């Protein structure tokens, strides 16, 4: 602990360019493990992580049925959205959904999530109590009174408290060696002249897991918070991550700058100096 399981649905209309498309991906923490694309010949829920591949036929059958139903549902939801917002049937629109659970050190449920968006903007969300909704506009309000009538929140609460947590625990068990063993970053500092009076110091962290990490630059103990170039964390491609942090320094004071790295794969925090 702690760990999370998330599902990401994307449903897209695209008149003239293709049939409506449904894509679903599953994550445990920062690792994707399943996917579904309705644009395949015979769409099936497919494995994306090696530790789920030895799950049996029953699992892929169940998930594929569920996903086909979800695809149908969300196509119709695109139609319904069209009516709700009084939009033309010639435009391209997108529904996004993310849902899932967070569990702690002992596998007990910490948090439930279920959020939905339409055309990039928040549409409707399940509240922390997992028994009510929050709608962002009037269409979303229609959806809310529908779901309240259908008692959706209770079924959702049921899924989040049981199946979601149990399967998450089983997954954390299937791939313990890659999901629960943090990979520490390989770190190093590089020097890149700008002017003859300025130079960039770049702190590199490579091949770390999981994705969350802290890279700071200190000038004699003070965090250069608002003068640090912090590039977004990026995937190496082998389920690990890369990050760097650059600080521009006056030449001759490279010594006064240190890079501090914290990551759960590290016993103690690192301090690096360019030499």
């Amino acid at each position: 602990g702690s760990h999370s399981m998330r599902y990401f649905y994307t449903a897209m209309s695209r008149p003239g360019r293709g049939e409506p498309r449904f894509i679903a991906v599953g994550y445990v923490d920062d690792t994707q493990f399943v996917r579904f694309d309705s644009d395949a010949a015979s769409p099936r829920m497919a494995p994306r992580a090696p530790w789920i591949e030895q799950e049996g036929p029953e699992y892929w059958d169940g998930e594929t049925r569920n996903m086909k139903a979800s695809a149908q549902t969300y196509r119709e939801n695109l139609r319904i959205a069209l009516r709700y917002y009084n939009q033309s049937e010639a435009g391209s629109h997108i529904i996004q959904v993310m849902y899932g659970c967070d569990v702690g050190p002992d596998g007990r449920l910490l948090r439930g999530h279920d959020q939905s968006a339409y055309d990039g903007k928040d549409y409707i969300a399940l509240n922390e109590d997992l028994s009510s909704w929050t709608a962002a506009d009037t269409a979303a309000q229609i959806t809310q009174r529908k779901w309240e009538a259908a008692r959706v929140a209770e079924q959702l609460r049921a899924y989040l408290e049981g199946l979601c947590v149990e399967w998450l625990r089983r997954y954390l068990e299937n791939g313990k060696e890659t999901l629960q063993r943090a990979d520490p970053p390989k770190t190093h500092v590089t020097h890149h002249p700008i002017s003859d009076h300025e130079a960039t110091l770049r702190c590199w962290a490579l091949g770390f897991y999981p994705a969350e990490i802290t890279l700071t630059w200190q000038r004699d103990g003070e965090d250069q918070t608002q003068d640090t170039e912090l590039v977004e964390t990026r995937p190496a491609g082998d389920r690990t991550f890369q990050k760097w942090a650059a600080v521009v320094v006056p030449s001759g004071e490279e010594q006064r700058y240190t890079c501090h790295v914290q990551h759960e794969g590290l016993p103690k925090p690192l301090t690096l100096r360019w030499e």
Partner: protein, 277 residues
């Protein structure tokens, strides 16, 4: 390969209009069309469409199975692979068949319904079609029996995506893409799983010749609108002081009421308890 599509519908009546679009390499720009067997013989004597092929008005000549090829220079032939087939079916060529629902048009969620399409005329094929833009019709062979041809379309497990208005068409042997006139429309409605409302009467269910009787449909759920149904009407709901939503239908027969929300005409709640007037 290009993506071929018909707007707004592939099933189109005579006198109507349908546009064929060919999307290839992020362009609808430059394509040729083909029918079902002269596969490498472009129609209109090999006419190039610099624009989406608009057919208007639609005649029975237009009916057929289309594929398109996109202009791809620096390429084995200068043309792409064949696109997805798109069948233009022209309706209004024969007497309409009949369509009926078994057991009825009101279908509980998760349950199944049989849409039966039958006719006096010996149709070779039947097509079930749901009213809507970009929809494919379902085909079934016509069984001949006792002087009538018929076909049983099975629809289910019932969800909102299958609710709506249905028409069936017939086609004879030698003109497969020429369909009959549409049958009289059938509104298939899914009921539930929205909680059922309560039904009452004012002043009561016992009524004689002289005076008024109004049915009150009530629920704690925010139904936008109530439907009154008798065995064998539509009113907006008003929010009452005790936070109940209610409708009052000013009027024998057995009645039930169904709640429903806005912009969603084909999905109703579970039926209320019956109330006989």
């Amino acid at each position: 390969k290009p993506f071929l599509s018909a707007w707004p519908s592939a099933v189109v009546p005579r006198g109507g209009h349908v546009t064929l679009r060919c999307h290839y390499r992020h362009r609808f720009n430059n394509f040729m069309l083909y029918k079902e067997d002269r596969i490498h013989v472009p129609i209109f004597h090999g006419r190039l469409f610099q624009e989406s092929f608009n057919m208007s008005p639609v005649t029975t000549a237009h009916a057929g199975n289309y594929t398109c090829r996109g202009s791809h220079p620096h390429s084995p032939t200068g043309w792409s692979a064949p696109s997805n087939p798109v069948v233009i079916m022209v309706t209004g060529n024969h007497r309409k068949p009949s369509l009926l629902a078994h057991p009825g048009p009101l279908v509980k969620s998760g349950e199944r319904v049989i849409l039966q399409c039958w006719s006096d005329i010996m149709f070779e094929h039947f097509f079930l079609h749901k009213e809507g833009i970009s929809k494919d019709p379902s085909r079934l062979v016509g069984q001949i029996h006792d002087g009538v041809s018929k076909a049983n379309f099975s629809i289910g497990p019932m969800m909102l995506a299958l609710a709506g208005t249905y028409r069936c068409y017939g086609s004879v042997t030698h003109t497969p893409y020429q369909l009959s006139a549409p049958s009289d429309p059938l509104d298939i409605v899914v009921t539930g799983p929205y909680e059922k409302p309560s039904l009452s009467a004012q002043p009561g269910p016992k009524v004689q010749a002289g005076e008024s009787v109004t049915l009150s449909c009530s629920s704690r759920s925010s139904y936008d609108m109530y439907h009154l149904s008798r065995e064998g009407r539509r009113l907006p709901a008003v929010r009452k002081v005790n936070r109940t939503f209610q409708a009052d239908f000013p009027l024998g027969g057995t009645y039930r009421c169904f709640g429903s929300f806005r912009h969603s005409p084909y999905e109703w709640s579970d039926p209320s308890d019956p109330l006989l007037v």
